[PDB]
Design a protein around this nucleic acid. Structure first.
Ligand code: ATP
Ligand code: ATP
Ligand code: MG
Ligand code: MG
Ligand code: MG
Ligand code: MG
Ligand code: ZN
Ligand code: ZN
Lengths: 356, 348
DNA sequence: ATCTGTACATGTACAGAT
DNA sequence: ATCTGTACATGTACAGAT
DNA sequence: ATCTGTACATGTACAGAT
DNA sequence: ATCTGTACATGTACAGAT
């Protein structure tokens, strides 16, 4: 009941979806078409809508869209970067419109992202119908972010991605553990889909900095979000409704509210809660473990699970098991103890942050 | 335990599967290769394996294989034949065939026939054509006898025809997303090769959904994991095998059952699987009651003379126009008999 | 004259609105 | 409960290219 | 266009554990 | 008797090479 009302608050409004989507699709079209022009390195790039808005778990407002401009790259070989599972050098065998980004067979991420970014910056300059500018580049981000003032503020991450169609990299052989949940035929079909490499683009100052790419599975997560039940009719017009997405929304909101108040939580992001709930959906595969009348209990066990990840400093990438998003190398003890105490306080005092 | 023992008897042998398949595949690849690699009107024909062997519900022996040679044909107009549901006239290479199903089948049949004659490493002949069949049937003697039905089909890539709009009622079983996706697949037209002497009979084709039935047979649970290595086993296919066996044994003994075929059984269990979508209703421990309610459903179809085509609902497969009332009453007494005496027929 | 990338045309699950 | 806008998959038409 | 190579589904088969 | 784990076999989807 309390949580039913929070969900009502988080529910997007069709009126807002219309206005935001009409603007967003205009810009994204125009950008996509410029990538196709003339002697552009990005000709043939294709569009893939990803993230919460397209999974129907975007909350509060339709004010952040994520879009992938993906480029298929044939005849590619990878060098895993220092056994991290998730980061790769991209190498070319033949000796090519990406030639300007080559650094002797090695494909530079930051060179490629700069050119991409330069092109985007130029196209929005020439947009005069709507109020749109290009955010100052954020370190670690694979994206060129647009700020649209639709009056209302809207962010769009244009994510640049390489598309390889070969089999997924060895480091993912043991990830995506959906066999007892969505099953083996689904797993096989998903792993026949391409995989994607986005620029890591860190500024830490370590070797291969600007030639390191990160694996991306936004497309797989989108499929899973919209096909999330052991039963094929889960959440369908002739099936039973579950509370899996509603639990994701509530946890997303807990993090947003908290992250909005306390800058100690800067190391945390929603992909952390998205990853945690993929594990919970694997742990509890049955649709009856997500009955809408047990929303309280399902949300409480998701919190219990997240707390245990924070305390044990272990939250494995759903697709790359050896990659721990909560390692001390990425988020230190005190950042995690701080969020642990904040969650545990909301848990045990009526979730007062839901009323802000 | 009775029925468990029968299903052991009906189980194909890995050795038999290997020898039949390697001989079948040899023939089919060669016919398929002639269809294109020789300047013929079927140059774009592609192979699609269908039926019980490829759905893993073949029983007793691997001795009957069904193959579809499908041909993409664009911008066809369909016209429904006297509101039959399932039979259509086709209008607009193939110029030398209103696209007459008979005329096209015959050249197709002529091509296979010539090719079979030039096969010298397999004992294979072409069966005499049956009025009623969309098929060119090969008889292979690998010592063991094996039938192959080579089924000519047109492939249309538009919306399924109106008569199916109410068909495929999987919504509460496999769901609306599977139904939508299946209906994005192409649909197929095979020759209605009757002899009845009725009106447009030579130019009529029939809708085929073997490709859709294959997916359903191999994706049959309400849970995605049904019958997978990390899921539970269900006894859905086992019931199909048991009901197919009962019919096969009955037909073998009674000439009165000539009008019945396995497709009747297949259609009935599709309705049952829709009626009882829950995987727990097809629990392996309950194989007996599951089979018995299949029997009871099939007898209710006979009693009421009503067994609608699972994809074309106004097409009654048990209409008087197709199976006489006497034939259905005969099958009813025989099934009721087996049912109430522990299936004596399963021992012979 | 035919060929074909681009974009319209069609249909429907998802979920908000009434 | 029904009505309805957006997203998305797939089929097709045609201006502009060959 | 046409074909092999790859990966894993669907099976059968049998021994050791239950 | 059934269950589990490994071996053994064919079918099928699709990437990539020619
Ligand atoms: N750190 C990350 N590692 C891997 N993939 C990530 C990471 N951050 C984001 N992504 C991918 O990019 C998508 C979009 O990122 P974003 O941060 O907008 O989150 P979201 O899932 O869209 O949710 P929201 O935008 O509502 O906070 C994610 O859904 C995920 O697929
Ligand atoms: N009367 C029919 N109407 C529509 N499709 C049919 C009909 N008869 C057969 N088919 C199609 O052709 C396939 C092969 O037919 P066939 O008679 O070989 O049966 P089957 O399903 O292969 O089983 P079995 O051969 O073991 O009896 C069927 O599964 C179905 O897809
Ligand atoms: Mg987002
Ligand atoms: Mg983002
Ligand atoms: Mg068969
Ligand atoms: Mg047959
Ligand atoms: Zn659900
Ligand atoms: Zn099953």
């Amino acid at each position: 009941d309390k949580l039913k009302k929070v969900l009502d608050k988080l529910r997007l409004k069709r009126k807002d979806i219309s206005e935001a989507a009409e603007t967003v699709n205009k810009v994204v079209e125009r950008l996509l078409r410029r990538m196709q022009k003339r002697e552009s390195e990005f000709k043939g790039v294709e569009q893939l809508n990803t993230g919460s808005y397209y999974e129907h778990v975007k909350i509060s407002a339709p004010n952040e869209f994520d879009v992938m401009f993906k480029l298929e790259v044939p005849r590619i070989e990878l060098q895993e970067y220092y056994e991290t599972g998730a980061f790769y050098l991209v190498k070319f065998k033949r000796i090519n419109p990406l030639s300007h980004f080559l650094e002797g067979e090695v494909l530079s991420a930051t060179k490629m992202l700069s050119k991409f970014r330069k092109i985007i910056k130029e196209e929005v300059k020439e947009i005069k119908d709507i109020d749109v500018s290009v955010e100052k580049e954020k370190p670690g981000s694979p994206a060129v972010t647009l700020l649209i003032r639709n009056p209302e503020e809207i962010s769009v991450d244009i994510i640049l991605a390489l598309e390889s169609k070969g089999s997924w990299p060895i480091s993912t052989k043991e990830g995506l553990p959906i066999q007892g949940w969505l099953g083996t035929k689904v797993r096989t079909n998903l792993r026949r889909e391409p995989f994607y490499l986005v620029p890591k683009n860190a500024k830490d100052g370590n070797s291969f900095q600007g030639e390191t790419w990160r694996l991306s599975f936004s497309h797989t997560e989108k499929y899973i979000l919209n096909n999330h039940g052991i039963e094929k009719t889960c959440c369908e017009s002739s099936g039973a409704k579950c509370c899996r997405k509603e639990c994701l929304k509530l946890m997303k909101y807990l993090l947003e509210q908290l992250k909005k108040e306390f800058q100690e939580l800067d190391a945390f992001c929603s992909y952390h809660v998205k990853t945690a709930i993929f594990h919970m959906w694997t742990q509890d595969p049955q649709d009856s473990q997500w009955d809408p009348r047990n929303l309280s209990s399902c949300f409480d066990k998701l919190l219990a699970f997240f707390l245990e990840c924070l305390r044990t400093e272990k939250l494995d990438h759903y697709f790359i098991p050896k990659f721990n998003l909560f390692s001390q190398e990425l988020i230190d003890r005190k950042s995690k103890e701080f969020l642990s105490k904040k969650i545990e306080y909301e848990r045990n005092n009526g979730f007062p942050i839901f009323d802000k």
